[PDB]
Amino acid sequence: KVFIGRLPIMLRSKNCYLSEATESDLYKLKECPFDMGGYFIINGSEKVLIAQERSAGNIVQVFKKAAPSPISHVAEIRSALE
Amino acid sequence: EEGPQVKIREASKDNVDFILSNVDLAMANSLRRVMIAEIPTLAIDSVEVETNTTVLADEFIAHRLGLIPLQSMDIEQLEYSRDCFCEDHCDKCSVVLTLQAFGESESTTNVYSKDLVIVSNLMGRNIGHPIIQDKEGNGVLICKLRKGQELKLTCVAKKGIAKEHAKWGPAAAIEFEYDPWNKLKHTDYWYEQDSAKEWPQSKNCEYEDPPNEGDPFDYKAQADTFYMNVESVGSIPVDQVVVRGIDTLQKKVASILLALTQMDQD
């Protein structure tokens, strides 16, 4: 019912024409059959989003403190609303 | 007959196995090189492209056109444009070929070296003919094209030699061996247990008497008798790639006498 912005699409993904396309379909589209998609195409250039690694959340872990420290050990839990 | 002798073993249209005997290694070798590097040939060396819509780029194609072998029997009677007095070139120094292809067939149209069309006057002489040894007689698949793909070129074959570019070489590979039973000790085989068992024996071992322990090391032994095999791309008949080689090298040796001469003047 209402339009709110444009969502850049990832090639070879469901919402991308190339998904269902095949061999001949592609050549006729000019896209290379061997392409593997997985990237975006913002303002002309092919953009790749790089996986960002990090520590899983909501988990309990204990670590010992340094010799100089009023604290001996500690139990940490990083709580995040999934 | 006189000095260094020959004894052609097998021999065909493309190769000439033979035994050069009673020659100096120096010479056997020089000849080998000369046959590869300096024998004159004719090859495409200028491609004026008018139209091309193939998948290959102009210079990609132009490149190939150069390696495509061409007739060079009477190359000895064509001039290096660099010596001919025309501004640029003529029939006295070049051969002009033409290439025109269009994809009429709905199925990949093939451009072959048989589609080259001489245009300049050959002044009657074996020269500039796309050498074909192909079974179907098409020789060298220049390139392929689809629907309405066109290719209109013009070539200008000129006289040349390997040193300038390989495309001008007529030899292409040359077998060369000597002293199959390391009697001269010109090598020192590597091995694990037994040199003999591990290192294959050569076909040429036969045509030469085996060693036989007892005997001391014959150091006086020099080295003649070379088992060579000159293969040819075609531009020139195998026998020629040998005689012409023998000749070219000779003229070279000559020019030095000649040079020492004009240098006599003062």
């Binding site: 050549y27 | 060298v140 698949l141 220049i142 689809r146 629907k147 309405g148 292409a172 590979a173 075609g234």
Partner: protein, 65 residues
């Protein structure tokens, strides 16, 4: 990407042999090793040339104008 005319190494013509070789495989149902020897490609410098070519030109052609 079209058969190379002549082998880089020794320069022996090889531009012609493409189609012949592709047959000795498909039709005459032979094995590369022999198909090559059949076409007169002796030493590996000439062998490796044909045996290894990747005729990309074909996927190229398959495009359009």
């Amino acid at each position: 990407m079209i058969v190379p005319v002549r082998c880089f190494s020794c320069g022996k013509v090889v531009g012609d042999k493409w189609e012949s070789y592709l047959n000795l495989l498909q039709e005459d149902e032979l094995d590369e090793g022999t198909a090559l020897s059949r076409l007169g490609l002796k030493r590996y410098c000439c062998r490796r040339m044909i045996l290894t070519h990747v005729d990309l030109i074909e996927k190229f052609l398959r495009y359009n104008p």
